[PDB]
Paper text:
In B. subtilis, only three Ser/Thr kinases of the Hanks family have been identified to date: PrkC, PrkD/YbdM, and YabT (Kobir et al., 2014). YabT lacks an extracellular sensing domain, but it is linked to the membrane via a C-terminal transmembrane helix (TM). Interestingly, the basic juxtamembrane region of the protein has been shown to be involved in DNA-dependent activation of YabT (Bidnenko et al., 2013). The same study showed that YabT is specifically expressed in sporulation and localizes to the asymmetric septum where it specifically phosphorylates the general DNA-recombinase RecA, thus ensuring chromosome integrity during spore development.
Residue numbers in the entry:
A (entry chain B): 3 to 124
B (entry chain A): 1 to 273
Write the structure that this text describes.
């Protein structure tokens, strides 16, 4: 309802507690209008907010999140990395496998490990 | 159930029992007991607005202390592991013939830390320890030391994965003496220092929690505890990876949780490249 719009607006709140709650809520609701706002929240200053946005994007399953989530594999925060890796798995499908294939080739570190292990499990 | 008061309270309070706050007038209907200890009894309780976890004690001082700990968490600029605080009040329990004090907090459920990492994988262990360290930094900056920090008191909610503490009993003001502790997680037991409430006490416990999370059991010290712990850490692929943080926490190298967090982040970064 107007809850979805409230939570999308709350992603711009000064409080990280409020932004985090909103990101998670939008993931549960599953509405598509939240995808672009959540992609922006992947760059939040707060690591919990980024983790919630990553999870929420995987939960929605909209493939607009695939390349932003791949970038999140480089996040300094390990909760964000694991959650993003998990989110890519949740979205799944050929486009993700396509990206992992590329990533396994021209990637490094964790992101490469994620790609390599994704390809081995598909 | 430790003193006569609390044990009599425990026998007194039944599902269906209602407790009404003296000062604020909120009514809590007990549904089931969640937990029992020296610091009080915890119930799932129903209100007109839903459900809460309700902690009840004859000791108003410890109830007030715990309330202020939860309030300290709630002042953080970010999320923390602590449950939200809702209410605190006194009440008279006619059956137990005693005045009691209580507080209501967020009811949270989820697998214990050890169950979570067993199910989702060991890679989550340092991740959840970093969340734990972030929350301890909040507490420490407010002058509180967790003290009896142990895995049975930590659950993981989500998704997304969040470590949470389910009881703050025994949190202690910095500078005072920690009196509530568990041997395996206790600096003093292992011969590595005092039970002074200071950040480094909590950091020792974090190291032991990570060791328990990997090893999946507790064990007694031997005659050579330092070599015992060194051997266990170095012999395990995951603990070895984080040995700088773990050894520094055991040895008292750190003054703040942020320093341990930094070393854990760095060890993770190296692998993540």
């Amino acid at each position: 309802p107007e809850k979805v719009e409230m939570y999308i607006k709350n992603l711009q709140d000064d409080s990280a507690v409020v932004r985090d709650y909103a990101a998670a809520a939008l993931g549960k609701i599953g509405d598509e209008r939240a995808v672009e706002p959540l992609i922006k929240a992947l760059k939040d200053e707060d690591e919990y907010v980024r983790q919630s946005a990553a999870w929420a994007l995987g939960e929605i399953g909209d493939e607009r999140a695939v390349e932003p989530l791949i970038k999140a594999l480089k996040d300094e925060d390990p909760s964000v990395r694991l959650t993003a890796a998990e989110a890519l798995g949740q979205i799944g499908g050929e486009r993700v496998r396509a990206a992992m294939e590329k990533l396994a080739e021209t990637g490094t570190g964790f992101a490469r490990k994620v790609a390599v292990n994704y390809l081995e499990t598909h | 159930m430790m003193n006569d008061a609390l044990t009599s309270l425990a026998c007194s309070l039944k599902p269906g029992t209602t407790i009404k706050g003296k000062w604020n007038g909120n009514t809590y209907t007990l549904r089931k007991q969640l937990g029992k200890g020296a610091n009080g009894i915890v119930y799932l309780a129903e209100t007109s607005d839903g459900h809460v976890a309700l902690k009840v004690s004859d000791d108003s001082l410890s109830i007030t202390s715990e309330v202020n700990v939860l309030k300290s968490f709630s002042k953080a600029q970010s999320v923390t592991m602590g449950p939200s605080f809702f209410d605190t009040d006194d009440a008279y329990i006619p059956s137990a013939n005693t005045k009691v004090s209580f507080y209501a907090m967020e009811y949270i459920k989820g697998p214990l830390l050890l169950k979570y990492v067993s199910d989702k994988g060991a890679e989550w262990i340092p991740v959840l320890m970093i969340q734990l360290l972030s929350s301890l930094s909040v507490l420490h900056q407010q002058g509180w030391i967790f003290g009896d920090l142990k895995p049975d008191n930590l659950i993981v909610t989500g998704p997304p994965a969040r470590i949470r503490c389910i009881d703050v009993g025994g949190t202690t003001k910095e500078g005072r003496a920690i009196k509530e502790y568990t041997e395996f997680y206790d600096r003093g037991y292992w011969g590595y220092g005092t039970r002074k409430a200071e950040p480094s006490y909590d950091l020792f416990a974090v190291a032991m929690i990570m060791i328990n999370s990997v090893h999946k059991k507790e064990f007694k010290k031997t005659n050579q505890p330092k070599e015992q712990l060194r051997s266990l850490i170095e012999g395990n692929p995951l603990l070895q990876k984080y040995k700088k943080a773990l050894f520094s926490a055991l040895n008292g190298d750190y003054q703040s949780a942020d320093e341990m967090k930094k070393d854990m982040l760095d060890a993770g970064q190296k692998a993540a490249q």
